[PDB]
Amino acid sequence: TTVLWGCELSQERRTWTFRSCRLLLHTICLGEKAKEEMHRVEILPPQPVTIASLQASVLPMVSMVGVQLSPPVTFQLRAGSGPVFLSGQERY
Amino acid sequence: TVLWGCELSQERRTWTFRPCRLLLHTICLGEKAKEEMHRVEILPPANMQPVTIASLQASVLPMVSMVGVQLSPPVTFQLRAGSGPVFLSGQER
Amino acid sequence: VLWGCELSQERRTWTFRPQSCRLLLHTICLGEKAKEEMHRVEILPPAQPVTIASLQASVLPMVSMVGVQLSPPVTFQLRAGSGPVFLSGQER
Amino acid sequence: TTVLWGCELSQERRTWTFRPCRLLLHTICLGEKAKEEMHRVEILPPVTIASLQASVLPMVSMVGVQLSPPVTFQLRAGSGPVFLSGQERY
Amino acid sequence: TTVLWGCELSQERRTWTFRPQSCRLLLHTICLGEKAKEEMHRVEILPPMQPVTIASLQASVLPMVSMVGVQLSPPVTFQLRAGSGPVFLSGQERY
């Protein structure tokens, strides 16, 4: 049974934790409100791993369909104001 | 098994798929779409926040290909930001 | 086997026929000769069209959609732009 | 068996042929030394598989395409260099 | 058993080798840091045979790429062939 999953990161709310046997991570997208500075999203333990770098006037968003993450997973907006959205599916 | 497609816009920013599995392939801006960024969401089914699946803009990225996304119906797409047209393609399986 | 086609304002359509009961669609690419306007490629019904790609020379000259499998007959149409636009795939 | 595979195309070497199995093709990338013109890469029996340009799209990923050898790539337009990467399987 | 993997390449560390029944490095994304300057970056894999180029990125053009589905057999040596970075690689160690 797969359920749709999503989150929004920003400078005000820089972190989000998924914490169902696997998180299927599909896309990462900038919101229309996001400033122009490069954005960077990392996954934190339990060093950080950078999974995406995006910029409004250069690369709207990115697809990474196929990535499957083992929970718990913490995302952090390591650089930029956001909003930055993430989409995916929980599967078990 | 069956090809699927839908165009979202200011006139129609919402669409819902019902019949097993929507394979979602690409999302593309139309040549008549104006400059502004466009954002496409999937709404949660009624039973917390819409899930953003694509951000596109004509001068910087006019489409994206997310082959491998497989959605269970009903699925409601919404054109959250932008006037469109924005197209969606995929297959009903 | 390997399969490809070129669409243009002169030749706007290109129908695939004959295993070869599956067309794997891999990439869609603008030619270096395509002019600056946005290009849109749709797939047409046998007997509403579905847009599968939007491209523009100065913004995004190609796209990969490896994984799409289509059931023949498939008719592609260059709905907008003058081309050339190329498609590639693998008859399966 | 799997072995990493790569080749480089350019005006000085327009084509490259892989043969003695499937070639898993991964990415196609412009070199930093490349010029600014649009580059187009074909597979010759031609089928165009990529268009790239340094100031617009310097590479593309094609993880999933599997080719039956022999396979000949051609730099149909542009001066290069253009790199291809993949994996020989079996 | 799968574990998240991530490395950072730069002028400082312009080469990293992932060393070892079985294990595959699943290679997911390669992304420029916001601190990378304007030059083109190119990342190779060096034979444990010439180097193989796997990505070309540039901040003002294409700051990252996804290559989900690439499964590398160790040993795998990554090299930042052109560019000062930082450039980040992400993936998972499987099995």
* SS3 per residue for E13-77: CCEEEECCCCCEEEEEEEEECCCCCCCCEEEEEECCCCCEEEEEEECCCECEEEEEEEEECCCEE
DSSP D10-25: BTTB-EEEE---EEEE
Cβ distance E5 to E66 under 8 Å?
Answer: no
Cβ-based neighbours of D35, under 8 Å, separated by 6 or more:
D54, D78, D79
d(CA A52, CA A61): 9
Burial of D10 (0-12, 13-18, 19+ CB in 10 A): middle
- Give chain C's radius of gyration (CA, Å): 12
- Give chain E's radius of gyration (CA, Å): 13
d(CA B39, CA A60): 10
d(CA C24, CA B59): 29
Angle at B54 (CA atoms; ends B59, B60), nearest 5 degrees = 15
> Is A63 part of the contact surface with chain B (CB cutoff 8 Å)?
yes
Contact A85 B50 (CB under 8 A): no
Q: Which residues in chain B have Cβ-Cβ distances shorter than 8 Å to C54? A: 28-31, 62-63, 87
Angle at E69 (CA atoms; ends E64, E73), nearest 5 degrees = 105
Pick the closest to residue E59 from E81, E28, E79, E34 (CA basis).
E34
* Domain that includes residue A6, residue range: 1-92
3-state secondary structure of B42: strand
The alpha carbon of residue A44 and the mean position of all alpha carbons in its chain are separated, in whole angstroms, by 11
Cβ distance D63 to E68 under 8 Å?
Answer: yes
CATH code for the domain in which residue B6 is found: 2.60.120.340
Beta carbons within 10 angstroms of residue A35's beta carbon: 12
Nearest CA distance, A55 vs chain B (angstrom): 10
C11 secondary structure, DSSP code: S
Cβ-based neighbours of E21, under 8 Å, separated by 6 or more:
E95
> Is B73 part of the contact surface with chain A (CB cutoff 8 Å)?
no
Indicate the length of chain C as a whole number: 92
Pick the closest to residue E70 from E42, E89, E87 (CA basis).
E89
A11: region left, alpha or beta (phi > 0 left; psi from -120 to 50 alpha):
alpha
Pick the closest to residue D85 from D29, D20, D43 (CA basis).
D29
> Is A16 part of the contact surface with chain B (CB cutoff 8 Å)?
no
In the complex, which subunits touch E with 3 or more CB pairs below 8 angstroms?
Answer: A, D
List the determination method: X-ray
Q: Could you check whether the bond before residue C73 is cis, i.e. omega within 30 degrees of 0?
A: yes
Contact A6 B65 (CB under 8 A): no
Cβ distance E95 to E3 under 8 Å?
Answer: no
Burial of E12 (0-12, 13-18, 19+ CB in 10 A): exposed
**Sign of the CA dihedral B78, B82, B86, B88?**
negative
d(CA C20, CA C91): 5
d(CA A65, CA A62): 9
How many inter-chain contacts (A to E, CB under 8 Å) are there?
71
> Is E62 part of the contact surface with chain A (CB cutoff 8 Å)?
yes
d(CA A71, CA C53): 35
For C50, the closest of B5, B59, B65 (CB atoms) is: B5
Tokens of E80: 């930042």
E85 secondary structure, DSSP code: -
- Give chain D's radius of gyration (CA, Å): 12
Tokens of E95: 């099995």
Contact E68 A64 (CB under 8 A): yes
Cβ distance D27 to E31 under 8 Å?
Answer: no
Half-sphere exposure of E73 (CA within 13 A, CB side): 13
What amino acid is encoded at A16 in this protein?
W
Indicate the length of chain A as a whole number: 92
Contact E6 A49 (CB under 8 A): yes
Cβ distance B18 to B74 under 8 Å?
Answer: yes
Q: Which residues in chain B have Cβ-Cβ distances shorter than 8 Å to C53? A: 26, 28, 63, 65
Contact E72 D26 (CB under 8 A): no
Contact D38 C32 (CB under 8 A): yes
Burial of B61 (0-12, 13-18, 19+ CB in 10 A): buried
Query: Count of domains in chain E?
Result: 1
Cβ distance D53 to C61 under 8 Å?
Answer: yes
Cβ distance C62 to C28 under 8 Å?
Answer: yes
Nearest CA distance, C54 vs chain D (angstrom): 14
Cβ-based neighbours of D89, under 8 Å, separated by 6 or more:
D1, D2, D21, D22, D23, D24, D66
Backbone angles phi, psi at E54, to 5 degrees: -110, -20
Beta carbons within 10 angstroms of residue D15's beta carbon: 13
Cβ distance C23 to C16 under 8 Å?
Answer: yes
- Give chain A's radius of gyration (CA, Å): 13
- In C, minimum Cα distance to B8 occurs at C51
Residue holding tokens 């954002």?
A: B39
**Sign of the CA dihedral E49, E55, E60, E63?**
negative
Cβ distance E53 to E44 under 8 Å?
Answer: yes
Cβ distance A40 to E43 under 8 Å?
Answer: no
For A65, the closest of B36, B56, B66 (CB atoms) is: B66
Angle at C48 (CA atoms; ends C45, C50), nearest 5 degrees = 80
For D57, the closest of C4, C6, C60 (CB atoms) is: C60
Cβ distance C90 to C13 under 8 Å?
Answer: no
> Is A35 part of the contact surface with chain E (CB cutoff 8 Å)?
no
> Is C46 part of the contact surface with chain D (CB cutoff 8 Å)?
no
Contact A54 E64 (CB under 8 A): yes
Cβ distance C74 to C5 under 8 Å?
Answer: no
Burial call A48-84: b when 16+ CB within 10 Å, e when fewer? bbbbbbbbbebbbbbbbbbbbbeeebbbbbbbbbbbb
**Sign of the CA dihedral D89, D90, E6, E11?**
negative
Residue holding tokens 């709310």?
A: A13
For A52, the closest of E6, E61, E64 (CB atoms) is: E64
Beta carbons within 10 angstroms of residue D27's beta carbon: 26
**Sign of the CA dihedral C1, E68, B40, E88?**
negative
**Sign of the CA dihedral E10, C60, A27, B11?**
positive
Cβ distance A88 to A23 under 8 Å?
Answer: yes
Pick the closest to residue C68 from C87, C83, C44 (CA basis).
C87
Cβ distance A9 to A15 under 8 Å?
Answer: yes
- Strands laid side by side in the E64-72 sheet: E2-9, E87-94, E24-32, E64-72
Suggest the residue from D35, D42, D47, D79 to mutate for an interface test with chain C (most C CBs closer than 10 A).
Answer: D47
Q: Which residues in chain B have Cβ-Cβ distances shorter than 8 Å to C37? A: 31
Per-residue H/E/C for chain A: CEEEEEEEECCCCCEEEECCCEEEEEEEEECCCCCCCCEEEEEECCCCEEEEEEECCCECEEEEEEEEECCCEEEEEEECCCCEEEEEEEEC
